[PDB]
Amino acid sequence: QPEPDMITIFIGTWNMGNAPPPKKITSWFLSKGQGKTRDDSADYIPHDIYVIGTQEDPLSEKEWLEILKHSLQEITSVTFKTVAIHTLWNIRIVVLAKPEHENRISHICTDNVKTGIANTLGNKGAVGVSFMFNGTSLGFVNSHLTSGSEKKLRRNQNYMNILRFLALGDKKLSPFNITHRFTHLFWFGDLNYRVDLPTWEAETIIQKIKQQQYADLLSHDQLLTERREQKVFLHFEEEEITFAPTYRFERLTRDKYAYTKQKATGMKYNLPSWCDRVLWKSYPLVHVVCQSYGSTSDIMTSDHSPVFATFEAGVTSQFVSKNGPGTVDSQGQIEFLRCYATLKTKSQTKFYLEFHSSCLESFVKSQEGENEEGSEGELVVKFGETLPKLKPIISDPEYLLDQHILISIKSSDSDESYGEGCIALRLEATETQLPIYTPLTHHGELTGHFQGEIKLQTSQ
Numbered sequence: 194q195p196e197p198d199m200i201t202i203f204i205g206t207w208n209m210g211n212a213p214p215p216k217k218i219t220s221w222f223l224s225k226g227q228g229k230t231r232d233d234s235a236d237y238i239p240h241d242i243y244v245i246g247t248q249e250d251p252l253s254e255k256e257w258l259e260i261l262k263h264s265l266q267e268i269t270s271v272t273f274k275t276v277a278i279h280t281l282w283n284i285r286i287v288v289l290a291k292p293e294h295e296n297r298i299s300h301i302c303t304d305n306v307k308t309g310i311a312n313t314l315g316n317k318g319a320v321g322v323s324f325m326f327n328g329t330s331l332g333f334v335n336s337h338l339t340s341g342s343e344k345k346l347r348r349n350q351n352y353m354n355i356l357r358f359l360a361l362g363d364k365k366l367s368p369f370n371i372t373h374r375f376t377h378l379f380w381f382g383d384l385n386y387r388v389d390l391p392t393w394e395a396e397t398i399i400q401k402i403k404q405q406q407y408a409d410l411l412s413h414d415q416l417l418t419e420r421r422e423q424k425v426f427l428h429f430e431e432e433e434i435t436f437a438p439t440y441r442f443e444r445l446t447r448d449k450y451a452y453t454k455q456k457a458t459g460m461k462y463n464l465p466s467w468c469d470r471v472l473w474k475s476y477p478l479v480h481v482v483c484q485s486y487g488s489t490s491d492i493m494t495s496d497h498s499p500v501f502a503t504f505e506a507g508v509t510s511q512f513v514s515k516n517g518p519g520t521v522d523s524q525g526q527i528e529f530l531r532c533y534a535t536l537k538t539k540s541q542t543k544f545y546l547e548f549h550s551s552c553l554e555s556f557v558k559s560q561e562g563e564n565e566e567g568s569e570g571e572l573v574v575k576f577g578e579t580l581p582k583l584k585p586i587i588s589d590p591e592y593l594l595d596q597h598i599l600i601s602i603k604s605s606d607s608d609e610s611y612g613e614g615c616i617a618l619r620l621e622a623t624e625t626q627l628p629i630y631t632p633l634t635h636h637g638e639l640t641g642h643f644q645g646e647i648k649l650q651t652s653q
């Protein structure tokens with residue numbers, strides 16, 4: 194049986210509004226309803242991995258797992274295996290996989306982050322799961338961020354606390370947060386960003402939704418505008434939204450949005466909004482294609498509608514040569530030429546690099562770079578041709594061209610990372626000097642850039 198080079202992944206997010214689900218929720222897993230929906234001809238074809246995020250989930254883990262497994266069994270006639278389940282308060286993530294994948298999946302991690310302090314600590318935060326699927330690392334985050342139209346900045350803060358403190362993936366990747374630890378990272382949930390239009394315009398917004406005219410609403414969606422201004426989710430993707438706002442509905446129908454202020458809402462308006470979202474970030478030049486992104490129309494127990502997204506995701510096999518794992522393949526090398534980092538920092542420490550990659554036996558520390566002043570104020574750290582030649586464990590080009598090098602630029606004084614980025618080895622040529630580039634981030638914010646040339650030697 195050949196190892197796959199592509200899998201499909203289902204992502205669901207549903208704020209259940211503290212209510213039990215209805216008896217049938219199959220439309221969710223079938224990507225049926227509004228938006229970018231899945232073809233009927235695919236209904237019986239199981240996805241490889243199903244990742245279900247709930248918020249305001251009133252069920253026990255056992256109760257929800259029985260519902261999910263029953264649902265998938267009905268659709269696919271396959272009995273899925275539980276990879277992981279993790280709950281923080283009423284925020285939950287379940288990962289299910291086809292049984293043929295059970296011995297492809299390893300290094301399963303779970304974690305949670307509680308957001309806020311005192312007043313604001315006790316119900317918002319995130320849960321996450323990571324694992325390896327053969328040679329590919331996969332990470333999944335379900336977050337329930339702060340509510341309320343006038344709290345976008347708090348949501349942005351919640352995002353940065355989650356990506357800083359969620360401890361998933363390979364702990365040896367110490368300089369890297371979750372936004373660099375995975376080949377594919379999916380981040381979804383009740384992100385709680387709202388359509389920022391005046392309260393007076395509620396009925397106008399409703400009219401627009403009934404006409405399926407979302408353009409003038411999406412131009413005011415706080416998540417799209419904050420992302421465009423680089424305030425949140427830097428270097429993440431989201432499919433175009435083509436489904437109606439998923440919040441706030443009257444329960445037991447989808448005919449009415451319940452937007453007016455009530456004691457139950459703390460006297461806050463809930464104008465129709467796209468609270469419920471799926472975003473992703475994959476390493477450069479890895480295959481990832483969104484094949485559905487929408488909301489169900491027939492699941493009406495909550496004041497939110499479920500959201501689905503599905504993806505094709507490239508995966509690689511667990512490579513064994515005669516040499517690596519457990520020795521180098523002298524036929525292989527990575528040379529970083531004429532490299533320099535441009536940093537936004539005002540500090541004047543010396544810097545060194547660390548190169549991390551599962552194609553290396555362990556991470557590689559460079560010598561300190563040479564600091565110069567950029568013409569527009571910046572720090573430029575030059576490494577010249579001084580950088581250590583990296584010796585991958587396997588030289589086979591079918592393996593090496595699919596790998597990535599994580600780079601951290603660290604202060605000599607403090608050993609703290611000032612910036613993190615990633616370089617693909619999916620080059621246009623081997624044994625050839627080629628330009629490379631990554632932005633550098635720290636705590637998910639832009640801190641600089643790294644650029645130069647690479648020369649990759651494989652066994653071919």
Ligand SMILES: Cc1nc(CN2CCC(CN)CC2)cs1
Pocket residue numbers: 417420421
């Ligand atoms: C929130 C926004 N980000 C962009 C830039 N990105 C647009 C898509 C592109 C991938 N084809 C990567 C860069 C414009 S608005």
